[PDB]
Write a protein that binds this ligand. Structure first.
Ligand SMILES: O=P(O)(O)C(Nc1cncc(-c2ccc(OC3CC3)cc2)c1)P(=O)(O)O
Ligand SMILES: O=P(O)(O)C(Nc1cncc(-c2ccc(OC3CC3)cc2)c1)P(=O)(O)O
Ligand code: NI
Ligand code: NI
Ligand code: NI
Ligand code: NI
Ligand code: NI
Ligand code: NI
Lengths: 342, 342
């Protein structure tokens, strides 16, 4: 597994990231305390996940750059850009966990729930975002791809934010409207909130670093990657209720938060009138017994089986897209990523 | 007054900003509802202030670009970049108002306090930030200053965020430590949280648009502008307690929020032991009668008089800095801005 193989060098590069994002400001001692908070923020919120998004930059870089061009410095830049993706994820999750009223993340209490943090986490999240552009400047300003990367990160953030807006719009608190939860709406939400940044961004970043900047190449890659990302968000939704939190590292809130989850969409597609009313009466509310009734209804409708069938069909479809669209990139770039997520 | 003179054309350019930040996504109808929320967000949070930061870009542009180079399109770009500064301010204020537990802003309820908004405002604030880079791309991508502007905005955001971190660190909730509130610490906080983005950013943006990209020119401008910005934040702190909210458009929260305000710093400098204990017992707490005791102590110490004397000395100092550092830029660039704020 090329990911488990690159993981150790990638993870060890973190203290170098933290050191340069502190060292860069030691010529201004007056911001010492702020920089110390930044370090706490990075340590708590950028470490402890699987690193799949950042590692995808590194793995793809190795597979797209001619081995003779992979010198020490280029590899440093690839690990930094990987870490930029992870910092973006860290920004996103800190803010998302506040907006979703989440409890735990990567097996520890959400940053905003720590005593003494609370809504100061809004600023911390944004500092994580700023660090991306500081690293890009420090490591990539002289490279021909510098502006492509800055623009890719900004664009990906805008897309992701538009997706979060749809997520939040489709899920008003205290307001049960199941008529909004359609398959068409679900697909749009997950394309924007998740697929672009989790799948397109890291590969595209590696493509740009390899000098692959053509509009058609990027469009073909994106065809595969946005579909992979849709599957990934369906799986996240499934695991929100049916996943083991000792493995997922977090407690699900989608039912309580009135979310347009893939589960509720599949539920509505299959439910009788009587089952629809049950869902209506119990969805979107904090009460544990109401949530349990929703989970029981999903179990009654065999949604776990439906998901396992979906995962098989999705995997086959993604593989067919790789056959259609991978060239001229090595298919391994996409296969290695599919292996991680399926 | 050159500001009141440019204000109308600037403010009318807003519906064009809103139209291009909607029109740009009409080739993706699936995000319609998100774009509609974005429009509400822009209307509520980018309109109703004095527009001093955005107008400074426009005024400076007119004074720094040779009149023969001020064609229709360049002026559009100057109004857009002005609006970028205002969108940055909109991002900042939406998030700040949440973190400060504020009630009103520009004479209406804070966006996050509207029923149905609440912490979804975290995402709205970030969308405002994303819009900056979308406008820069749409209007300035072909210009030689495009990367300078992207980098200036990102840098200014990072500085501002580091300043907000210090603000929040120096003001822990439920925790009265007046020993932290020193003059040295106060200056650092306000340089970073306010001076860079409110004063340096808009002028620098105009400088870059005029092709003035030299490190020394920018450093000289910054010497004036960071001091102006310190004065501006002292004044904001004074008005937080002593300003008329029908004029400021907002209710102050600095005492309740345990802030390192210029007022509390001046208070500590002058207070007897007995007055120190009063401050200690009453600062940083929600109770209206405690806040009132703090205000009474500041009045007992003639802090309003101290502020009026400060404003006179600061104005003279800023004018002396303009004499030292304005050349070769027209002094009017700095004088017009000083006139607005003093
Ligand atoms: O990991 P989680 O299951 O919490 C998922 N988290 C997730 C997935 N995709 C995008 C985001 C995201 C991105 C930006 C956000 O806010 C921007 C201002 C920060 C919030 C959330 C968050 P979700 O809540 O969608 O089920
Ligand atoms: O207008 P206000 O009096 O509320 C002032 N607002 C203000 C002044 N300077 C900087 C900010 C600011 C910037 C970024 C922020 O958070 C970034 C993630 C958004 C929060 C606040 C906010 P302050 O609270 O400092 O007295
Ligand atoms: Ni979430
Ligand atoms: Ni979410
Ligand atoms: Ni989820
Ligand atoms: Ni405030
Ligand atoms: Ni504040
Ligand atoms: Ni204030």
């Amino acid at each position: 597994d090329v990911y488990a193989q690159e993981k150790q060098d990638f993870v060890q590069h973190f203290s170098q990231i933290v050191r340069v994002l502190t060292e860069d400001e030691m010529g201004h001692p007056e911001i010492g305390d702020a920089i110390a908070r930044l370090k706490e923020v990075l340590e708590y919120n950028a470490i402890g996940g699987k690193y799949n998004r950042g590692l995808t930059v590194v793995v793809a870089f190795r597979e797209l750059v001619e081995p003779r061009k992979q010198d020490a410095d280029s590899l440093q830049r690839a690990w930094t850009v990987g870490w930029c993706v992870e910092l973006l994820q860290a920004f996103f999750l800190v803010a998302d966990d506040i907006m979703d009223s989440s409890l735990t993340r990567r097996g520890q209490i959400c940053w905003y729930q720590k005593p003494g943090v609370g809504l100061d986490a809004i600023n911390d999240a944004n500092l994580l975002e700023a660090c991306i552009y500081r690293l890009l400047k420090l490591y990539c300003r002289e490279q021909p791809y510098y502006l492509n990367l800055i623009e890719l990160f900004l664009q990906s953030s805008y897309q992701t934010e538009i997706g979060q807006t749809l997520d939040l719009l489709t899920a008003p608190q205290g307001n049960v409207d199941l008529v909004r939860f359609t398959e068409k709406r679900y697909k749009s939400i997950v394309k924007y909130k998740t697929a672009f940044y989790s799948f397109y961004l890291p590969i595209a970043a590696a493509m740009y670093m390899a000098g692959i900047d053509g509009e058609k190449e990027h469009a073909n890659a994106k065809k595969i990657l946005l579909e992979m990302g849709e599957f990934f968000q369906i799986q996240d939704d499934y695991l929100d209720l049916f996943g083991d939190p000792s493995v997922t590292g977090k407690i699900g809130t989608d039912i309580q938060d009135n979310k347009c989850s893939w589960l509720v969409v599949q539920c509505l597609q299959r439910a009788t009138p009587e089952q629809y009313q049950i869902l209506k009466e119990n969805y979107g509310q904090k009460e544990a017994e109401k949530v349990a009734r929703v989970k029981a209804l999903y179990e009654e409708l065999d949604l776990p089986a439906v998901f396992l069938q979906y995962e098989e069909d999705s995997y086959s479809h993604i593989m067919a897209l790789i056959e259609q669209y991978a060239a001229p990139l090595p298919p391994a770039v996409f296969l290695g990523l599919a292996r991680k997520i399926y």
